[PDB]
């Protein structure tokens, strides 16, 4: 049951936009809402509006009086001397709650005229006509206007609606909540050479009487929220999908072949999401818009998605096809379960984020294989256990503070830190995988189909929300639908992993009792760390003995420590028979390293990742080597690679080398075995016999049979030896001699890989392989032996580093004339120059990176150069570079770059709270408090980034470096 | 390619990793584009 | 027989 927090119900909204002026960056328009009051004596009506100048408001064609105030413009007063962050977080939460449409509130308060009170008490319709104007928007609509001359379509100027969550208040007045569903009528009067893309279906396109402008009329009969309404106006090249004909793809001019190749896969994503769920795609059209200077890499609205143009690749670009493919896939998953089925509160957001991430993981499983699915699930689980042990924990479904261990309030999406938002979505889809583990996948897809079917029977009624609230899901409704389809309720699993905000830590060690033939496990939990919680459920453990692989369920109550499980025979060591594996197959194992008295070959605690856990198991090194070689699970091979770094014995070198030589191993395991072999080789110097590690293996796999030092000409058509070939010198460059310097046998090998590179014969580009070659050249740089702080000049350069510097100079200059796909070699060469500057080789001068961080460059070059400037101002304690970065945060045209500068200055801070630094003035505290209070008031993501930066630099209490 | 890059760095605006370093390791100076996605994303040999 | 793009650009400049 859904009861509105608003005293009115909104039925229909007309959004008309005229006069989109690109020179002056200005729009004019009106908005006409059709509300039905649910309570009599409505009097004031409270709507949401930011940055719009409200000209006039007429209610039922009668002139009404409005008052506007935004408390989130300046959160705390300018003349308050408070400088602690808990004060700002409480004031910011109160300010966002005072404009919240999820309460009754709002920023624009319109007073109902007196003569309509007899129209409002007996509950009859009210039609509110606001007309507004955005004079030069700092948020919401982003105007990308290039400085080439010509007409606005000839130079490539466009507008798009940017922002996250409820940010539609930034470009027209609305009820900007996900729970106020209404039908829509959208008119946009644009230039005759431009096209206006929006939500709904385009009913017509009429000309103006001078035929210089045309009006696009859109209609949206599926009741969506105001937060799902978008806009993209530009000189877009239109491409109808040749497979599905209601799907149109819009790109920027001159990028039509890239659009043709890139969006050619999307019909398979549509077919997948419509056959695992049994509902068809709910909207009547689908539109993909590719734009410049995007807010996020992929945004999903109702019947529309806005991607950045940096996803567009051609047919000869690999290492970008899977990333763009999965961006399209998660946009479509959010089309199904973020835009059609919406949110009932700010709680129950974990339901939608979990269903979107879970069905996108099912797509990844079918498309890229079960092994890529397991690797992705393991990397997401490692991400969340790192974040939750780092700071507190992520609390899905809080109850309204519920989480007081962290420096922001979790009551609203616009007060969350961006890393918390990312980990929120990550934990939501892993908890949905856990619900699939308890209640099987076919019942899970039946739950999702029941939600979609209730929403689509709801979506066709005309009753104003008598039935339109069946399109809003809640937690209680989701659990009730689960209990309807399965008969089991998941309330212990919901109580543990949703309502409780923690992950578990397992420390395991075994001992084999030879007398009674049992395996005595010893599993203890660390439940006193700040991020942890105590697990009391069951726990699966998989033991591989000589007779095969056996699963055991252990009951781990609070007082439990020793778990005795039984062991089988050892009669497959009496005769040589094959040892049967986890799957149905069996292999020949070399049992010379195994103990004579124990049959068990390896043990895995929680193999299926059925809890949110971090396992620290103490096996013997031969058990880790057997688990690396003969396991049929990629997460166990990865964890054995990760645990073999502590055992540098030559049997582990043989194990990793046999993994590296082995095709029919998953390629991301061999790419990890490269770096593990490099670390082991560095640890057993003065024992290593022959050549450096992986060199003979590289010449055996990727070089000519007649010439060992000449590499084969590039043929990248295998896509697994391409990735292994481009990752093996990067790990090989981490080799070090007894003198702690990279050997001149590996550096010469990398330089010969660079010289003899011929790419005139493959059908794929070479930009990522050459960029990884520059990364391998950067890995070999050891710190220089400066004497008496000698100035680093050209004559006293290292003889090794002069070759590296010549190569990166040649590569960067050749990129200036023949550019790569996304300037990958510019990014790699800037990263390598920063590596050479971090050691004492090149003079520590930020002027090159400051010239590459200007506005007109590509955004990857910009963020690489700004990363180099952030690293410089951390190491050299530069005041003027920090003022340069803070000025670039305040006034840069691209808001993604501002968010990225705040992000990089949070990750690599110039000082922490423990450090005494020269950059701990009252002036810097006043600048960052002014940046939290004012200055970042237009983005909701810059303000949370400024809160994160103030927390990283000065902590939760009063800045110490202050009177 | 070395001859081409030295010729293009000598007859234009130049940068340098070292102080006043034009003879050895000359860098072609970074110029901003008005539309950078066109020179980034588009293929040149097709 | 046909100059590579590097030396084609060098010839042009």
PDB file of C-alpha atoms in Angstrom, chain B residues 10-40:
ATOM      1  CA  UNK B  10      61.732  22.099 -34.630  1.00  0.00           C
ATOM      2  CA  UNK B  11      59.366  24.007 -36.965  1.00  0.00           C
ATOM      3  CA  UNK B  12      56.630  24.669 -34.433  1.00  0.00           C
ATOM      4  CA  UNK B  13      55.873  25.366 -30.818  1.00  0.00           C
ATOM      5  CA  UNK B  14      57.899  23.057 -28.615  1.00  0.00           C
ATOM      6  CA  UNK B  15      57.971  21.833 -25.034  1.00  0.00           C
ATOM      7  CA  UNK B  16      60.778  20.211 -23.090  1.00  0.00           C
ATOM      8  CA  UNK B  17      61.126  17.876 -20.136  1.00  0.00           C
ATOM      9  CA  UNK B  18      64.388  19.610 -19.187  1.00  0.00           C
ATOM     10  CA  UNK B  19      65.200  23.305 -18.895  1.00  0.00           C
ATOM     11  CA  UNK B  20      65.908  24.745 -22.371  1.00  0.00           C
ATOM     12  CA  UNK B  21      66.090  21.377 -24.125  1.00  0.00           C
ATOM     13  CA  UNK B  22      65.317  21.673 -27.829  1.00  0.00           C
ATOM     14  CA  UNK B  23      68.203  19.759 -29.452  1.00  0.00           C
ATOM     15  CA  UNK B  24      67.747  16.586 -27.380  1.00  0.00           C
ATOM     16  CA  UNK B  25      64.208  15.198 -26.874  1.00  0.00           C
ATOM     17  CA  UNK B  26      62.052  17.936 -28.443  1.00  0.00           C
ATOM     18  CA  UNK B  27      58.328  17.596 -27.781  1.00  0.00           C
ATOM     19  CA  UNK B  28      55.682  18.912 -30.141  1.00  0.00           C
ATOM     20  CA  UNK B  29      53.614  21.275 -28.029  1.00  0.00           C
ATOM     21  CA  UNK B  30      50.102  20.276 -27.046  1.00  0.00           C
ATOM     22  CA  UNK B  31      47.505  22.178 -28.952  1.00  0.00           C
ATOM     23  CA  UNK B  32      43.843  22.185 -27.898  1.00  0.00           C
ATOM     24  CA  UNK B  33      41.219  21.108 -30.400  1.00  0.00           C
ATOM     25  CA  UNK B  34      37.859  22.789 -30.741  1.00  0.00           C
ATOM     26  CA  UNK B  35      36.190  19.366 -31.073  1.00  0.00           C
ATOM     27  CA  UNK B  36      38.442  16.683 -29.531  1.00  0.00           C
ATOM     28  CA  UNK B  37      36.283  13.580 -30.057  1.00  0.00           C
ATOM     29  CA  UNK B  38      36.671  13.879 -33.831  1.00  0.00           C
ATOM     30  CA  UNK B  39      40.435  13.520 -33.673  1.00  0.00           C
ATOM     31  CA  UNK B  40      40.256  10.952 -30.873  1.00  0.00           C
TER      32      UNK B  40
END
